[PDB]
């Protein structure tokens, strides 16, 4: 009551969506629960209850059903679709969003996660992996023990073991290389 | 020419800042001007400018030429919507004399500030400024007070956000840490009082500006700032959404949106999340999205202080604030650094009339010589008060051990509490259960008989429960349910305390 | 001790006591003397920004009587945080040897003049109108400057009209004090 | 000069207002100075001034000018006690600019109006102008309202 | 209680007296009751109750007893005494 809402009124949405390293022009406007996609110039429909929190989503696109799944989004634009049961990485950007976006600096981005290092000071309880050995992304490589919790290494992904630099019983600090992974 | 001919000179003046050679230059170091990253941040024709003409009025060191004279002066200010909720913004030109501070620079964001707390509605700031404009000397200095007192005045008030999306040194820091919440982009802000240049003059320390004051030094070291962002686009996004949690005032109560997330969604993978034997750690940010509406949490220093988590949430649709220990970090006990955190946290949602929720997993305090040196027991008194003081609903839940001082800290019933769950793991205690024996015990031979009674007897939430000081064992299963009702019920919770100024908080 | 430069542990020292005077209804008296912030990357890497936020705060939100007393330098936000005049203070005094800047004046020199061969003029001049306390004197930043020998006196007598001092505020469950 | 020195030579010049001779010529006119009047209007050894060095900040039309400087800037503000009770005085000094009114002067005005309601004591205001500092063109009619 | 007052500590009262288009100096102290009073270098001592509201004021100058009206005052200084019988205008 104190401050009335004023809707922002919108007639059509124009956005740069990124599929796979190429920039679609779609427009897009709405119904009640309808909405007109434009895509690079071809015309779609699709309807839907729209629930945004329930697992499943079932659309109609052109009469067409679909049964697709968000498994996340952020509010920088990114978002992972299962469709076809295939999982689609895709950036939706406003259209001035989208044009300002060329004036910033693409980044260094190198972060090595093949080194795998002790997070705090503790005692190495067991090592669970010797070089040359196969380790999944999140399988344990290594337990380290402070102030009795039994805390939990885990690999950063899929690998081998180039070098194993920690031993049983050994007392590590923070920022210590414990394994190596290629 | 015309009076109205050189109205228009003076707009198209002003909508270029200081110059398309120093917005070219802007724009080469990655960053954005002022007017377009309020175009980014406000609904698209939403924004209504104010001052638009007014200049600066030094006459000193030349500064009355014409060619030192600029519309605007290195500030655009005014009002606009976020989805539809009024807002009050202002972004600092760096392209204006480096986006110095002068007098009309303070009496514009004053000008601003003033009507937003005059209507009731946030305070966004976007800061891009080298300091003070050392022309106007004395002068400048008056506007920074000018401006601090607003934020002091406006504390509690209405809220306000700092941005930081370029340099920030000197004085001008100082206006961030009065505001509620501190946001920087990464590899192009930064905030130090002072430079390397002088850190090496005086302590002859080699230091660059990224390791002096950059994003990664307030956002993990200091504690100063609350998140860090990418790129000036990515900040701004995050921005409108971090803005949709927030009341617009304290006269307000929390945001309600729809929500399609049903209030009694069963959570049976919560079951077994926490393992039986407590030398193993598991993620509470993992319990955190399972209860909360559709798995959204935004967090709140996120790489600070990990043994503590906070952040925003929404139940049912109305917004909430989680504090929570984490058992995968340093065994999840407080500390200094994470006391502040939390405290902070919790009078922020609690002057605001946001509901709190806690997670309660703590064996005790960090030990060592080097917390106690600290002022561990005056850092630890903070959260402990902040809990102590919020009138707001709060609802806690414990998952496991909670013993000694830290179970009263994280927001204990008797701190005036509203509800207090416990699940079937929990231990209520004033130590660890063979501390507890060697203490009671000693003297006495047969030590493993009345072991195995004590642990029997008090190494569960049985102890608690028979005295009233959790309302029920639960289900972990049912926990979001529980929370959603409860918080429907204390909706309309209202407190009666002393009249006072105001208190006094250990610092 | 450390020529007066403010710091972390000084500015909660001095915030906590503020704070706790200001709730009782004890007026409050200010010596100012302070060059800046202590630099290095100890201070920074340890919160200098909020906990200098800390006493500023305190000093903003008081309400009590507050006078203060400019003995000397007052340098950048040093100055603002120290009860300045423009936090609603009540009474600001300067000796003669006070010194309100926002810089000291052989960097303000540097940074204004630089780019300019005849730096000693200048400089000579600019120390001459600016190293004093004239130029906060002139926009009324102070009431006046007092001899030192008054100082009492002159806090005596502010002490009696400012004891009905009431002022009124903007409603709120309570602030958010940097912590 | 020192700075000392310098401050004894603002008293001074503070002061005596406008000159001697605008003083003199105030008085044949058969009119006080305002410092003469607020002395009669106040307890003996009462009245603290408040304000003695502001100066006009114009700088149009050669009022930058040393000569154009002058401490305090057509109005003597303060405090003092009738009868033992608290009080708040301004007093317009017409020997400065014919007493016209600048920016400073309603910045002092106000300073002390504002003091005045913050402890909730009476104003008395001596009137002596014939206007508006027309020099400060717009800036004037913003000191009056802010005054209003 | 919320401004108490604050008394104008004088000793000694310098006054100009205009009697008859002559101007005396005066210096005038008190003590209790008991005004001490030179004018013009004269030393005189004057006692009474000071009862400013009744029509007739007695006091003692120097031990000689008198009976004076005071039939009107102004804030100006214009003050008419009767004196011997006779209404004297001082300033
Ligand atoms: O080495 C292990 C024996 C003592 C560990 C006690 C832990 S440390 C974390 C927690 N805080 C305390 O004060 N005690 C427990
Ligand atoms: O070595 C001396 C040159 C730089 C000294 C600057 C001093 S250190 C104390 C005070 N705080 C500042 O930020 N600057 C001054």
């Known amino acids: ?182 | 020419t015309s009076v109205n001919e050189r109205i228009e000179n003076k707009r198209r003046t002003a909508l270029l800042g200081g110059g398309q050679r120093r917005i070219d230059a802007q724009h080469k170091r990655g960053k954005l001007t002022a007017r377009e990253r309020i175009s980014l941040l406000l609904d698209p024709g939403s924004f209504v400018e104010s001052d638009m003409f007014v200049e600066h009025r030094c006459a000193d060191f030349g500064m009355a030429a014409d060619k030192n004279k600029f519309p605007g002066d290195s500030v655009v200010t005014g009002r606009g919507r976020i989805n539809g909720r009024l807002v009050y913004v202002f972004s600092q030109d760096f392209t204006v004399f480096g986006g110095s501070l002068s007098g009309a620079h303070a009496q514009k964001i004053c000008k601003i500030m003033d009507q937003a707390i005059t209507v009731g509605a946030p305070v966004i700031g976007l800061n891009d400024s080298g300091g003070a404009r050392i022309q106007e000397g004395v002068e400048s200095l008056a506007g920074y007070a000018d401006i601090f007192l607003r934020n002091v005045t406006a504390s509690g008030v209405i809220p306000q956000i700092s941005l930081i999306m370029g340099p920030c040194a000197g004085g001008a820091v100082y206006s961030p840490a009065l505001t509620d919440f501190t946001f920087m982009v990464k590899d192009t802000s930064y905030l130090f009082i002072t430079g390397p240049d002088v850190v090496k003059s005086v302590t002859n320390e080699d230091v660059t500006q990224e390791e002096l004051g950059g994003a990664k030094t307030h956002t993990t070291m200091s504690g100063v700032a609350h998140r860090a962002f990418e790129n000036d686009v990515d900040a701004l996004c995050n921005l409108r959404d971090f803005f949709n949690y927030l009341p617009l005032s304290s006269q307000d109560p929390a945001p309600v949106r729809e929500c399609h997330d049903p209030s009694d969604r069963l959570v049976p993978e919560l079951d077994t999340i926490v393992p039986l034997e407590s030398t193993k750690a598991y993620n509470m940010v993992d319990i955190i999205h399972s209860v909360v509406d559709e798995r959204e949490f935004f967090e709140i220093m996120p790489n600070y202080a990990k043994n503590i988590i906070v952040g925003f949430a929404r139940m049912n649709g109305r917004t909430v604030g989680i504090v929570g220990n984490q058992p995968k970090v340093a065994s999840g006990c407080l500390d200094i650094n994470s006391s502040v955190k939390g405290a902070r946290f919790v009078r922020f949602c609690d002057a605001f009339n946001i509901p709190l929720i806690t997670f309660v997993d703590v064996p005790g305090f960090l030990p060592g010589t080097a917390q106690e040196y600290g002022g561990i027991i005056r850092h630890g008194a903070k959260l402990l008060y902040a809990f102590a003081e919020a009138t707001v609903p709060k609802v806690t839940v414990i998952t496991r051990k909670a013993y000694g001082g830290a179970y009263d800290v994280m927001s204990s019933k008797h701190l005036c509490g509203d509800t207090n769950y416990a699940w079937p793991t929990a231990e209520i205690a004033v130590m660890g259960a063979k501390g507890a024996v060697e203490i009671i015990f000693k003297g006495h031979e047969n030590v493993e008989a009345a072991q195995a009674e004590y642990i029997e007897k008090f190494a569960n939430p049985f102890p608690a429960a028979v005295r009233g000081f959790v309302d029920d064992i639960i289900q972990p299963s049912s926990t979001r349910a529980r929370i959603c009702c409860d918080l429907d019920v204390l909706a309309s919770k209202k407190v009666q305390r002393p009249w006072r100024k105001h208190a006094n908080i250990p610092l």
């Open chain 1, 1 to 182: 009551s104190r401050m009335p809402v004023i809707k922002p009124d919108i007639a059509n949405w124009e956005l740069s969506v990124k599929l796979h390293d190429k920039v679609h022009t779609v427009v897009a406007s709405n119904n009640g629960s309808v909405f007109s996609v434009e895509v690079d110039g071809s015309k779609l429909n699709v309807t839907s209850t729209w629930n945004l929190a329930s697992p499943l989503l079932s659309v109609s696109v052109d009469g067409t059903q679909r049964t697709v799944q968000c498994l996340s989004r952020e509010a920088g634009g990114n978002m992972s679709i299962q469709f076809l049961g295939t999982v689609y990485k895709v950036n939706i950007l406003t259209r001035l969003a989208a044009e300002l976006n060329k004036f910033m600096l693409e980044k260094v981005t190198e972060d090595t996660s093949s080194v795998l290092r002790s997070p705090m000071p503790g005692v190495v309880v067991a090592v669970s992996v010797k070089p040359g050995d196969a380790v999944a992304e999140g399988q344990e490589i290594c337990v380290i023990e402070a102030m009795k919790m039994q805390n939990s290494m885990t690999a950063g992904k899929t690998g081998t073991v180039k070098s194993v630099h920690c031993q049983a019983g050994d007392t590590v600090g923070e920022g210590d290389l414990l394994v190596e992974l290629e």
